[PDB]
Amino acid sequence: PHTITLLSFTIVSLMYFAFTRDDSVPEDNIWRGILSVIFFFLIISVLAFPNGPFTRPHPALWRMVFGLSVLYFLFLVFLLFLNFEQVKSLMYWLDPNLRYATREADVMEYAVNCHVITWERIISHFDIFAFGHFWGWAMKALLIRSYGLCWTISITWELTELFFMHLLPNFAECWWDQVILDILLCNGGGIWLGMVVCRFLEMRTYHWAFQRVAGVYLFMIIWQLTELNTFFLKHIFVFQASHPLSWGRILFIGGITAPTVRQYYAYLTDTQCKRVGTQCWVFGVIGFLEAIVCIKFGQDLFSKTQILYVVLWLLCVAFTTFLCLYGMIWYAEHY
Amino acid sequence: PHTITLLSFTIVSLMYFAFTRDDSVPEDNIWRGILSVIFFFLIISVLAFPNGPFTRPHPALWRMVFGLSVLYFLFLVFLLFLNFEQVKSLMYWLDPNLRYATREADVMEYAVNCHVITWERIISHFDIFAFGHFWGWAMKALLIRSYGLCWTISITWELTELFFMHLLPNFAECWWDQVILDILLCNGGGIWLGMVVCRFLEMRTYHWAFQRVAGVYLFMIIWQLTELNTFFLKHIFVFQASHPLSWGRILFIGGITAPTVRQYYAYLTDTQCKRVGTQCWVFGVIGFLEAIVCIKFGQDLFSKTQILYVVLWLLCVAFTTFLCLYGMIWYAEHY
Ligand SMILES: [Ca+2]
Ligand SMILES: [Ca+2]
């Protein structure tokens, strides 16, 4: 009796908490209502939603994940209709402290004269972005499960930062920062650790090696767009990278992406079951809607964009993806 | 390409309507956002939700129905947390005209001296409730598909009105009204027409003829509770039986009940597939939550209720259900 026990105990707890508590404070009432709606939507998701491609930890968890994905998609569909003032008011209601917050890029100097080696600057890098790079790349290596594709994405993200450096003037990094730290160390160790963990724990290791020439390219484009919507949202709706919104969205996207990459790999070379399911389309639409919301609400960064780089980073990502695919095919063929 | 065409055209229409329109009026923005969230939730429902027991008209329609059911269930879960002032404010926002509306039972006289036969009163019955009885019972005969069970419910509803006459003093009807019109004509013709339609259109005809002694009783209890929540809601949150809320909820409940009765009949005597699915549990929880919301927000009708009738109409419904079951079993056995 799964549904019988799951939809009769929670209902009793719901009616108990509804009757026993007070109802004077209106905003607290609205917050409790939102929390209960989210909880019961997760329950309905566990009850009636497709299982998905993963069944190891629990088949029910990847139904709560689909429910969260649908909730975020509908939240973006809603947020697409408000104006800037209403979205800012909603942000202030979520956290009042966001009322007093300045952009990390409005008043700050990046890519300063970079020849110095004094320890005053080097040790002050592990604050936020180094932790983010390292452990986020461990998570991404768990999602991707490859040394080739992970390193390709790590190399492509630096090109993306370089090309989109005229909109958000914080992607500007010292040349001895991108190549040394962000690539060789801060991400290299992260990929190494993520793959060592993926091998220790009994997981698989995808290969990605026709239709793959364009499939992997579309995958790379969606990946870069989703990794860029983070900074777009952080810059349009002002807040910091430490506010719970930023890393909350990061962890949520990692969770939603864990089954999406598997479904896309299944639709890719398996010579078997294909026609990628719903979760992949929902994730693609989530990425597209985040991009659309950024383009709509910002309208000031993209006012000064250049179409000489938006259509050139595409070609650079395409060349990087083709070279990575050929290198992986050669490594698999000769070894 | 079902999802490919369904989730790429609607997204383009969404972004077009979002960018092209204005955003000055805040309440209109919130209303458009709610409408778009409902529409895209119906799309997600068509994409990923179980088919159900019906497949004749279209298997997708009974996914939009499940989506609407989940939406109403979550709406009740939310409404359970607000206070009376917030619910009344939400009602006023849905329709401002509800600000000036009086109860049809606060100032009105029912069950007056009933011996007169002058045509002044007889012809003035087909206003709202006669139409409701007749065509609602056509719909109920389409949902139930039986002369025995439909007549049993039609006879049990008069007992329910008689027993719950001390809370809402509008159930009081002339004895020559209930027996003659509401039973023999206003519902009799409705059941006859509904069954003639169910035979004309190529449908089935359930039988309902152990575990059925209690199953049909629970079905009858849920049916009466759902038919009574209508008047409870109409009396607690003041409005009329002609306001779009009343008949909108009636049609919605009919739609949600169309597959629920089939799933319950399947779990009942078929000697085959059993373990009634999710839709039946969702409908039962919807009925229970409507009852709980009425009990919470009213708290004035039920303050003067009598536990000598709430535990007696149960026994009367049980006796009526047992007698109907025995009569149907005898009619099937000897004929
Ligand atoms: Ca970098
Ligand atoms: Ca009646």
Cβ atoms of A16 and A36 within 8 Å: the answer is no
List the Cα angle B71/B75/B79 in 5-degree steps.
Answer: 175
Burial per residue of B49-85, b for 16 or more beta-carbon CB atoms within 10 angstroms, e otherwise: bbebbeeeeeeeebbbbbbbbbbbbbebbbbbbbbee
Cβ atoms of B153 and B188 within 8 Å: the answer is no
Cβ atoms of B216 and B326 within 8 Å: the answer is no
Closest Cβ opposite residue A15 in set B48, B73, B292: B292
Q: What is the distance in A from the centroid of ligand 1 to the CA of B22?
A: 38
Are the beta carbons of A29 and B292 separated by less than 8 Å?
no
Q: Which ligand is nearest to the CA of A164?
A: 1
Whole-angstrom Cα distance, residue A276 to residue A262?
10
Q: Which ligand is nearest to the CA of B129?
A: 2
Whole-angstrom Cα distance, residue B280 to residue B48?
18
Q: What is the distance in A from the centroid of ligand 2 to the CA of B181?
A: 8
Are the beta carbons of A26 and B83 separated by less than 8 Å?
yes
Crossing angle of the two packed helices B61-79 and B26-47, in degrees rounded to 10? 130
Closest Cβ opposite residue A285 in set B7, B34, B289: B7
- CB atoms under 10 Å from CB of B142, counted, come to 17
Q: What is the distance in A from the centroid of ligand 1 to the CA of A101?
A: 24
Are the beta carbons of A83 and B44 separated by less than 8 Å?
no
Whole-angstrom Cα distance, residue B146 to residue B121?
33
Crossing angle of the two packed helices A129-144 and A147-163, in degrees rounded to 10? 140
Q: Is the alpha carbon torsion for B104, B109, B113, B116 positive or negative?
A: negative
Tell me how far CA of residue B306 lies from CA of A292, B296, B311, B319, in angstroms. 59, 17, 9, 21
Whole-angstrom Cα distance, residue B123 to residue B126?
7
Chain A residues with CB-CB distance to B24 below 8 A: 83
Instruction: Assign residue A63 a region (left: φ > 0; alpha: ψ between -120 and 50; beta: otherwise).
Output: alpha
Whole-angstrom Cα distance, residue B188 to residue B179?
11
Whole-angstrom Cα distance, residue A20 to residue B181?
45
Instruction: Assign residue A193 a region (left: φ > 0; alpha: ψ between -120 and 50; beta: otherwise).
Output: alpha
- CB atoms under 10 Å from CB of A169, counted, come to 14
Chain breaks in chain B (C to N over 2.5 A) after: 209
Nearest residue to B77 via CA among A69, A38, A20, A45: A38
Nearest residue to B163 via CA among B178, B148, B147: B178
Tell me how far CA of residue B267 lies from CA of A132, B263, B274, in angstroms. 53, 6, 4
Are the beta carbons of A73 and B40 separated by less than 8 Å?
yes
- CB atoms under 10 Å from CB of B197, counted, come to 13
Q: What is the distance in A from the centroid of ligand 2 to the CA of B133?
A: 8
**Assigned token pair, B76:** 């009740």
Cβ atoms of A235 and A105 within 8 Å: the answer is yes
Cβ atoms of B49 and B63 within 8 Å: the answer is yes
Whole-angstrom Cα distance, residue A180 to residue A187?
10
Our measurement of the distance from residue B293's CA atom to the centroid of its chain's CA atoms, rounded to an integer in Å, reads 15
Amino acid at A4: I
Greatest alpha-carbon span in chain A: 72
Amino acid at A328: M
Q: How many CA atoms lie within 13 A of A302 on its CB side?
A: 14
**Assigned token pair, B88:** 């009344």
Q: What is the distance in A from the centroid of ligand 1 to the CA of A189?
A: 15
Nearest residue to B152 via CA among B315, B324, B330: B324
Residue listed under structure tokens 């009974």: B62
Cβ atoms of A318 and A217 within 8 Å: the answer is yes
Are the beta carbons of B48 and A50 separated by less than 8 Å?
yes
Burial of B274: CB neighbours in 10 Å, binned 0-12, 13-18, 19+? exposed
Nearest residue to A261 via CA among A216, A228, A231: A216
**Assigned token pair, B310:** 């709430």
Nearest residue to B169 via CA among B317, B304, B296: B304
Are the beta carbons of B3 and A278 separated by less than 8 Å?
yes
Chain A residues with CB-CB distance to B49 below 8 A: 48-49
In angstroms, how far is the first alpha carbon of chain B from the final one?
A: 52
Cβ atoms of A222 and A284 within 8 Å: the answer is yes
User: Closest Cα of chain B to A218: distance in Å?
Assistant: 15
Whole-angstrom Cα distance, residue A125 to residue A147?
25
Cβ atoms of A80 and A295 within 8 Å: the answer is no
Cβ atoms of A125 and A173 within 8 Å: the answer is no
The domain spans of chain A are 1-14+23-48, 51-105+127-334
DSSP string, A118-143: -HHHHSTTTTTHHHHHHHHHHHHHHH
Closest Cβ opposite residue A18 in set B3, B7, B296: B296
Cβ atoms of B2 and B46 within 8 Å: the answer is no
List the Cα angle B212/B213/B218 in 5-degree steps.
Answer: 85
Cβ atoms of A40 and A76 within 8 Å: the answer is no
Tell me how far CA of residue A131 lies from CA of A111, A175, A224, in angstroms. 20, 20, 20
| Site from B24, B68, B77 to mutate, A interface, most A CB atoms within 10 angstroms | B77
Whole-angstrom Cα distance, residue A201 to residue B94?
54
DSSP string, A66-124: HHHHHHHHHHHHHHTTS-HHHHHHHHHHH-GGGGS---TTTS---S-------HHHHST
Our measurement of the distance from residue A335's CA atom to the centroid of its chain's CA atoms, rounded to an integer in Å, reads 34
| Site from B81, B83, B276 to mutate, A interface, most A CB atoms within 10 angstroms | B81
**Assigned token pair, B29:** 């923005």
Cβ atoms of A270 and A132 within 8 Å: the answer is no
Cβ atoms of B271 and B211 within 8 Å: the answer is no
**Assigned token pair, B73:** 């269930």
| Site from A31, A77, A267, A292 to mutate, B interface, most B CB atoms within 10 angstroms | A77
Are the beta carbons of B278 and A78 separated by less than 8 Å?
no
